[PDB]
């Protein structure tokens, strides 16, 4: 939006990286510094979620790309998802293969 | 966890918090640029104290980190940029004081208007009229009145004024750790850290003299060029041994020598090389000229702007009903957007233009991928630098005769090549010895060198011995000459005008080798040169997060500022300059004057 | 092969020699402490012999490194503990002179009798009746005689020798590259071989005088709080701006204060928490007493102890039958062997005791898998901090009525709480400015900033300032007050005393945060703490194989010794005294005196 879309966030800090396939919703101020802080804001005490605001006046390298990810497994499962197969007609007085 | 790790993840949290912030201020001062009104100058206004603030609190935040136990170079530099306090040192007295001598000398430069004995309602400010008389006026007396008057209304009402600025300026940079005010500016060169490339405050100072040594012979010559041809419009008032007067230099300060090639062309019976009829024949427009600009980029291997670049900008000042600012500026607002606000004519100075404008673009884009504390060039010489050799390469006769400017029938003789040499030594070397006495002065003020009872008798020595110009009447020590100019009385550096123009003949003399010319060094041209742009981009690309000689050897492959190139630029009006400098004495007597 | 393959050779045959031949001087040691008999004296002195003979022979050989072609900081910090030549440097006449002064010294001061005017037959010692008439007597003039007539003759005695045991130490330090012999002691701090954790010796005076700045504050107050205490106890000879005599501290030497609790108590109407009865109610015993503190270790995160522990070690004592050193020791005899000797008694004094020994149990246990000449602490100061940390943890009100000590029916109030931080403060904080100024003395004086014809007027000058004590009656330059210290004249270090009092809040202060504490520091208790546990015994396991600096960081985080955790400490404490200490002048006047 003209205005900012700042509805997208993102963390930026973290104690360690994420598994694979991995969320986490944690909220929790990250200890930068030696102390936790109790659960402030403040010097060596930062946020781990930041904001975005997308604008249209942004560059190609900072528009937003809605990104989709399809993950694939075979579990040795009966498969029972299946795209489709084929549609023909149907020939009468003629042998055909079937 | 360590300090280093402390130090990148507050500098992770800056970077984000800068970059959203700066893009704020950059599109509300495009709004108020593109549309003066009210309501963008609101937007400007609350945006300017939003970022002011945010880089206030965000710096006495990084004062808590000693910077002592960091050994990673790129944490350093940022930090560096950062943490440095400014005038937040000084008292509360002092700093209110002090903005408040910067906020009247604006003000007084701007709205000031001298009056004129010959009627009391026919006053001029200081652009409009008073500046064409200096240029286009040959009258004797009604110059040199003009010249006398602007300094005795401006000088004497500011030199209160700078005698109070000197010693606040002092106090504050020495809070800093430093030597002077003078050495604040000089702080900007200085490379510490990485041994191999160091450079210190005190080595730019005997870098411009030792360099300015190889300058004088080619101004002694020009000089006395000028002077030679002045005599006969000028009669009865020059010496032929003696000095030049400063209301004859064709400006108000005598920066610049453009004025006077109406007066010494060598060769006055061929016009200048000009495609300004050239474009309307062919019905070209502002679109037409960055498009052909364009192609010039991406032929020496630079990418294409981006799509907001041709949608955002505007390049064609819609008239009377949207107010805008008819200077060429380069806006980067950042986050990959890039505008160009410029009222692009069908003009010869607007194609060049247009190429300087464009040329910034590519340089900022090109450290896009640097850090906002690091997103920016080499040194204060370094962006401008890249913006001029564009247009010198795209003012070749060559250049605009493959575009479609320049007949094919149309062959370069030797006096068109010596009226171009010439008028650009009146605007590239003719403001080397301005330049180098005033940064020279200053820096003596600023660390004490001349005691506050010789600021006018320093300044005419000075200007008598490096430049050669007399002063036209005697001056009493309450009138002020330096105040008298924009980067002077507004606190701007004006050095960065004397490294660019040598950096400007360094960066054309490091792509003719890669483009394999064969002829003199005014006559090259990068287009179509892929070697030359891929070793240019490599050190573009770099910007701020590496020292400023290291980049210079990327493409030039000199660890140290040199005036090499700069000679072999005007070889060939050297030469000439010497066969015709010999009916008189060379050089300039400072015992004469004109009273 | 190289240097480097030889020294690890050397090593690994010496580590196994060390630690067989060590451990049979240490069983033959606590054979000797369990049971003083003829048989067992016999025993520790041909091992003791032994033992030294061969440190001796081993450090000789290792002589033949240079020490300088090695990388290793392992190899090297090994080979610094052994290379070490010592007292071996000087001459055979010197080497035997100053071990006769050190042999009498401890002669006279252990066998040091003054006889009294009142009766010919009516002398005491140091221990038995000297010290219980400077600590339970309240006349003036008992204790005044009592303070003057020890110095008088153990003073006297032993200035002659003082005077040839400093010349005698500094050539001995000076001729083993060292500037003094108060700088052999500060080399124990010494880091180097490491960059970014290197700690200098003579940062080390620096260090404890800008901590030194810090504890004045609270030390004021609670010098005039004591001394507006003691002037009802002892009327017409405190003077309300004056400074306090010597005599009236509690001890002879004034090192701890415990003694004048009975006297400067805040609130007498409540006695103090005390668990002594409450044991005998439950019929507890010195098995118990283990039990329970084993208990809380292992809750923290430490492992259990030995097989061995509960079966040889005898923590009671059998009676008149098997003579016993009733001093509470920890013994670590090696290769798993891990004892504690105390005759452990039904008190609440015997309870924190118990769990002082068993801390430092823990401790020797976490540094097992290290070699033999890295098989101690950080520094002279880190293994009595974690010893001390545990009892105070153990003290809190919370944690004795968790393991049934105190009735539930019992809530802790502000009056208990200021009887508790004062009664601490008179031993832990209230021995800091003695400790302050009595090494600050002796490093002069090994240095020869001090002059010998000045030993006594700087040590009663820097008395006056820094702790406040005036001297009661005149002295005469023969006489020697430090040389009436147990720990001065046998040739022990004092510092070591308070870097453990600044690290031990230190520790404090970085376990409460792990565990989540709510309140004061007085009030945190590290039981059931399995973080605190796992990140403190991550210190306790690197011992002495890494530098002090890198292992305060892994508990505390500081590169450098703090003394704000002290200050937090007492906080409810200093806001306390500064409400009560307004109603005279705080402070004290070096210029007055009593006579
Ligand atoms: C220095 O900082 C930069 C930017 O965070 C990082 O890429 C680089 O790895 C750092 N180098 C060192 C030696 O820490
Ligand atoms: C402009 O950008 C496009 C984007 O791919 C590029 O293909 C083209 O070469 C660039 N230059 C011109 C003159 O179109
Ligand atoms: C550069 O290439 C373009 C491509 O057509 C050509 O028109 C122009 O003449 C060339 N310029 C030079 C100097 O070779
Ligand atoms: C240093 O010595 C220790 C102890 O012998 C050994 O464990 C370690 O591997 C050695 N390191 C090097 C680099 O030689
Ligand atoms: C740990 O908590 C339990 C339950 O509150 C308590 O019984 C136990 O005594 C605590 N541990 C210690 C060492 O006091
Ligand atoms: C004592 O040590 C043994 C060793 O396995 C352990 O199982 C037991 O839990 C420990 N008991 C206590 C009270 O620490
Ligand atoms: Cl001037
Ligand atoms: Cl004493
Ligand atoms: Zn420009
Ligand atoms: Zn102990």
């Given at each position: 939006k003209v205005g900012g879309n700042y509805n997208y966030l993102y963390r930026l800090f973290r104690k360690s990286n994420l598994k694979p396939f991995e969320r986490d919703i944690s909220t929790e101020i990250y200890?930068?510094?030696?102390?936790?802080?109790?659960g402030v804001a403040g010097f060596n005490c930062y946020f781990p979620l930041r904001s975005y605001g997308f604008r249209?006046?942004?560059?190609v390298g900072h528009q937003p790309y809605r990104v989709v990810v399809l993950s694939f497994e075979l579990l040795?499962?009966?498969?029972?998802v299946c795209g489709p197969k084929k549609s023909t007609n149907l020939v009468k007085n003629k042998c055909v293969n079937f | 966890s360590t300090i280093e790790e402390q130090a990148k993840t507050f500098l992770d949290k800056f970077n984000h918090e800068a970059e959203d912030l700066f893009y704020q201020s950059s599109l509300a001062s495009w709004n108020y640029n593109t549309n003066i009104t009210e309501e963008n100058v609101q937007n400007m206004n609350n945006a300017g104290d939003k970022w002011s603030a945010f880089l206030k609190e965000q710096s006495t935040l990084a004062q808590?980190?000693?910077?002592?136990?960091?050994?990673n170079l790129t944490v350093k530099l940022q930090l560096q940029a950062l943490q440095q306090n400014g005038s937040s040192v000084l008292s509360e007295d002092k700093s209110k004081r002090l903005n408040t001598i910067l906020n009247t000398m604006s003000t007084i430069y701007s709205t000031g208007k001298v009056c004129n004995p010959?009627?009391?309602?026919?006053c001029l400010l200081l652009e409009p009229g008073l500046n064409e008389i200096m240029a286009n006026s040959l009258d004797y007396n009604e110059r040199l009145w003009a010249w006398e008057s602007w300094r005795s209304e401006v000088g004497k009402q500011l030199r209160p004024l700078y005698e109070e600025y000197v010693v606040l300026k002092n106090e504050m940079a020495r809070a800093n750790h430093y030597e002077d005010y003078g050495d604040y500016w000089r702080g900007d060169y200085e490379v510490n850290?990485?041994?191999?490339?160091d450079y210190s405050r005190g080595q730019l100072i005997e870098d411009v003299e030792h360099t300015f040594e190889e300058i004088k012979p080619l101004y002694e010559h020009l000089h006395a060029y000028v002077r030679a041809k002045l005599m006969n419009a000028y009669?009865?008032?020059?010496?032929?041994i003696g000095c030049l007067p400063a209301?004859?230099?064709?400006?108000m300060w005598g920066?610049?020598?453009?004025?006077?090639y109406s007066l010494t062309?060598?060769?006055?019976?061929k016009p200048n090389i000009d495609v300004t009829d050239a474009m309307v024949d062919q019905a070209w427009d502002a679109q037409r000229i960055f498009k052909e600009a364009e192609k010039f980029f991406v032929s020496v291997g630079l990418p294409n702007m981006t799509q907001g670049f041709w949608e955002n900008s505007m390049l064609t000042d819609p008239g009377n009903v949207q107010k805008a600012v008819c200077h060429p500026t380069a806006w980067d607002?950042?986050?990959?957007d890039f505008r160009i606000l410029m009222c692009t004519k069908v003009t010869m100075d607007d194609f060049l233009t247009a190429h300087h404008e464009m040329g910034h673009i590519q340089y900022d884009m090109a450290?896009?991928?640097?850090?906002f504390l690091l997103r920016?060039?080499?040194?204060?010489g370094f962006h401008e630098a890249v913006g001029e050799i564009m247009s010198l390469s795209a003012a070749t006769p060559k250049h605009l005769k493959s575009i479609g400017?320049?007949?094919?029938?149309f062959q370069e003789d030797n006096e068109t090549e010596i009226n171009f040499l010439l008028k650009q030594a009146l605007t590239i070397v003719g403001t080397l010895p301005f330049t180098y006495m005033l940064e020279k002065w200053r820096w003596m003020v600023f660390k004490g060198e001349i005691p506050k009872d010789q600021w006018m008798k320093k300044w005419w020595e000075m200007k008598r011995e490096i430049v050669g110009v007399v002063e036209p009447v005697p001056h009493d020590?309450?009138?002020?000459?330096?105040?008298?100019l924009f980067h002077v009385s507004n606190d701007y550096s004006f050095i960065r005008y004397y490294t660019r123009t040598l950096y400007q003949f360094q960066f054309q003399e490091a792509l003719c080798q890669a483009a394999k010319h064969e002829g003199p060094?005014?006559?090259?041209?990068?287009?179509?040169?892929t070697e030359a742009g891929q070793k240019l981009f490599n050190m573009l690309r770099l910007g701020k997060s590496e020292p400023w000689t290291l980049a210079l050897e990327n493409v030039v492959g000199a660890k140290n500022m040199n005036v090499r190139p700069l000679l072999n630029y005007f070889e060939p009006l050297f030469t000439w300059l010497k066969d015709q400098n010999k009916n008189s004495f060379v050089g300039w007597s400072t015992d004469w004057s004109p009273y």
């Open positions: 200890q930068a510094g030696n102390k936790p802080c109790n249209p006046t942004y560059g040795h499962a009966p498969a029972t | 808590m980190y000693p910077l002592q136990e960091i050994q010959d009627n009391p309602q026919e850290g990485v041994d191999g490339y009669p009865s008032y020059i010496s032929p209301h004859l230099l064709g400006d920066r610049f020598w453009t004025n006077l062309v060598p060769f006055g019976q607002l950042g986050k990959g450290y896009a991928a640097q850090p920016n060039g080499a040194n204060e400017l320049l007949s094919p029938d020590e309450t009138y002020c000459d330096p105040a008298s060094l005014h006559k090259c041209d990068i287009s179509n040169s």
